């Protein structure tokens, strides 16, 4: 059962990494513009219930990938199924720091299920 949890997190991790890898490259002309948008970051992200903070930013994440031209739909399903009122850090981040943050979170939980 925690096997299913771990596999779901791995799928989350890979999906988030595919997005980051997709946008964070010089073959992407819209990168500079994409980095102007602000993403809100979890005040704390140490438990699965903290994924609420991710779920609440999936729509803007989608919008910014949109206005720069699904994985998101799959991420949304995984997040809902893995997943408390969300507390956000005071300073916002770029789409790249946002993704890197939730990639680290995902890797962290995965390791505590090994």
Which residues neighbour 91 within 8 Å (Cβ) at sequence distance 6 or greater?
A: 41
CB of 1 to ligand 2JY, least distance (A): 11
DSSP code for 25: S
Q: Which residue is nearest to ligand 2JY (CB)?
A: 11
Spatial distance between the Cα atoms of 10 and 108, rounded to a whole number of angstroms: 11
Q: What angle is formed at CA 107 by the lines to CA 112 and CA 29, rounded to 5 degrees?
A: 170
Cβ closest to ligand 2JY, residue 34 vs residue 51: 51
CB of 73 to ligand 2JY, least distance (A): 7
Half-sphere exposure of 40 (CA within 13 A, CB side): 16
Cβ closest to ligand 2JY, residue 53 vs residue 82: 82
Cβ closest to ligand 2JY, residue 71 vs residue 93: 71
For residue 111, which of 21, 1, 5 has the smallest C-alpha distance?
5
Residues found near ligand 2JY in the complex (CB under 6 A): 4, 7-8, 11, 74, 77-78
CB of 49 to ligand 2JY, least distance (A): 18
Spatial distance between the Cα atoms of 92 and 19, rounded to a whole number of angstroms: 19
Cβ closest to ligand 2JY, residue 46 vs residue 74: 74
CB of 7 to ligand 2JY, least distance (A): 4
């Amino acid at each position: 059962s925690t096997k299913k949890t771990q596999l779901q997190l791995e799928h989350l991790l890979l999906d988030l990494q595919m997005i980051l890898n997709g946008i964070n490259n010089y073959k992407n002309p819209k990168l500079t513009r994409m980095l102007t948008f602000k993403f809100y970051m979890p005040k704390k992200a140490t438990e699965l219930k903290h994924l609420q903070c991710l779920e609440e930013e999936l729509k803007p994440l989608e919008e910014v990938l949109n206005l720069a031209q699904d994985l998101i739909s799959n991420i949304n399903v995984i997040v809902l199924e893995l997943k408390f009122m969300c507390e956000y850090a005071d300073e916002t981040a770029t789409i790249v720091e946002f993704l890197n943050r939730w990639i680290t979170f995902s890797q962290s939980i995965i390791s505590t299920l090994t």
